[PDB]
Structure formats: C-alpha cells, structure tokens
Design a protein around this ligand. Structure first.
Ligand SMILES: C[C@@H]1O[C@@H](O)[C@@H](O)[C@H](O)[C@@H]1O
Length: 295
C-alpha cells in the first residue's frame, strides 16, 4: 500500500488512479463502521463527515441507530456515495438481525421475499454496494426459519449466489456453530467477527469455527475505537504498535491469510480512551493499520 498517503490527502489524478489500482489488486482489506448519528450531516454537534474517510479504505458501513435526521440520508445519497465511489470505497448498509426476525413480516416464503424487498430498498435507493447483517443473538426455531428465508431471498440480488458483484456481509460476535451461519454461509461475501477486547490467543479458535465454510480471504476480525461514554475495550491503547488493533492487523490464521480487519466507530479514529468529547479525525490509526497489513 506504498501508494496510500502518509496523511489524509484525498488524491485527484494519476495519484488517485494508483489507489484505484491498489484496490483492484491482492491486499488485506480495511473496513470501518461509521456511526451515522455521528456524521456532521446528522443533527448538531458532530465533527466527522463520511467525506473525510481515507482514500485507502476498502468498505465503509453506514451504521444507523434510527434517530438520524433526514438530511443525513439525503447527503449519503446525493454526496457521500458518489465521493466514496470516486475513491474506490464501497459503501454497505448495516441492519441488525432484529430486522430480519420482525414478526410484522409473515414467516412464509412470500414474507421472506417481502422483507428482502424492503431491505433491498436501503441498498438500491442509495446506490450502495450491499448489505451487512449484524448478528449478536441466538434465534429460536421460528426466528431461524425467518432469517434464513430472508438471507436466501437477498442472495438473489447480493453476494456470491447473485452474480451482481454486490456484497452480502455477516458480522457477528458469535462463532461458526450458530445455526443461522450453518444455514446462510453459501450466501455470504465476507464474515466479520466483532473481537473487541479479546485475547490474541483465542483468534485461531474462532477462525477454526468458520474455516470449513469460507476461504480465509472472506474472514475479517474487528477492533473498536473508543466510543464517547462507551465500553472501554482497550483495543487502541498507546503506543499504537503494541495495541490490540495493531496485533489484529498482523495476526494470520496458521497456514493462511485473512481477508483483513475492520474498526467499529471509525468516526472515533485516534480519540484517546476516556475522552468523551467529539473531535475531528485525520484517520491516522486506519491509514497506519492499512500499512501494517500491506507492507
Ligand atoms: C459480547 C461482545 O460482543 C462484541 O462486542 C465483541 O466485540 C466482544 O468481544 C464481546 O464478544
């Protein structure tokens, strides 16, 4: 990734083209969850724009909580998606598993299709590159049937079964024994393991629970930046090169190469642990971690 800037410059010419070429070639990828309610185009008081995101990012997740102002969604559609696409950055909408097990939607083939159609509007209306499902709970038999049905309906438009080039992503804090994963693994582009605060020594065990269902390049492990007023996971302690985030950038499963890493709350890149104020960011941690993976 020598072609990436040592600061947060947005390249423009042959300098941009080299970044677009880097992204088309083999490399460990970097993804980031951008908390939508923290975007400067949402409400008041925020300091970071999705426009700020570093050129060498591979995937930005639009990660809302549902109280965002209309202006955020307008800006995403009209300004952010075009600008990130100009940088070869993919933009994926995140939705919680709760949305796919919502009992307002019939637990039938027609209901799975109807709910998939509604979810595909969050992709198609914004010009996005796919959908990310956040799975952080176990499912009862009925929930598992409904979620599996929706994934199978989505797989007509997204992910490896679709042929569209659009992504279907499974992000989870659970392992590859979860029934939902056993049901939907053939539909998935990337699997992202929420690994905030975890032991470097337990990473192989988790990877081993998925590895029969994927190739290693589909697998990403995630750390968290420090969220204002949030959990102190301690993934981004100083010095950087000793951090959990840095150890994740360097970690490889035995005999294979992982797909890469992601951050939770990429809008918080470089804010000190315990600092509960909002700050601008030049994405030093994101840019350095891309370098750590692609030397
Ligand atoms: C229950 C928690 O869920 C996610 O936040 C993971 O990132 C943590 O490591 C932990 O498993």
């Amino acid at each position: 990734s020598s072609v990436c800037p040592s600061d947060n410059t947005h390249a423009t010419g042959a300098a941009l083209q080299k970044i677009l070429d880097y992204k088309k070639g083999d490399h460990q990828i970097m993804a980031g969850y951008f908390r939508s309610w923290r975007d400067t185009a949402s409400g008041t008081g925020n300091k970071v724009s999705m426009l700020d995101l570093p050129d060498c990012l591979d995937i930005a997740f639009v990660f809302p909580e549902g109280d965002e102002t209309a202006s955020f969604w307008t800006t995403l559609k009209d300004t952010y998606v075009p600008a990130l696409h100009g940088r070869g950055i993919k933009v994926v909408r995140s939705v919680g598993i709760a949305q796919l097990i919502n009992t307002a939607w019939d637990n039938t083939p027609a209901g799975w299709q109807g709910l998939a159609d509604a979810l595909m509007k969050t992709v198609d209306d914004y010009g996005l590159d796919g959908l990310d499902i956040d799975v952080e709970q176990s499912l009862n038999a009925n929930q598992l049937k409904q979620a599996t049905g929706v994934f199978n309906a989505l797989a007509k438009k997204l992910g490896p079964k679709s042929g569209t080039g659009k992504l279907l992503i499974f992000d989870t804090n659970m392992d590859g024994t979860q029934p939902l994963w056993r049901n939907v693994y053939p539909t998935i582009s990337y699997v992202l393991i929420q690994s905030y605060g975890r032991s470097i020594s337990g990473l192989q065990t988790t990877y081993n629970s998925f590895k029969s269902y994927i190739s290693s390049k589909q697998y990403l492990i995630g750390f968290s930046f420090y969220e204002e007023n949030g959990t102190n996971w301690g993934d981004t302690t100083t010095p950087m090169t000793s951090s959990r985030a840095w150890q994740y950038a360097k970690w490889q499963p035995s005999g294979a190469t992982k797909g890469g890493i992601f951050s939770y709350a990429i809008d918080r890149d470089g804010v000190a642990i315990g600092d509960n104020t909002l700050k601008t960011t030049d994405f030093t941690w994101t840019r350095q971690l891309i370098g750590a993976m692609n030397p």
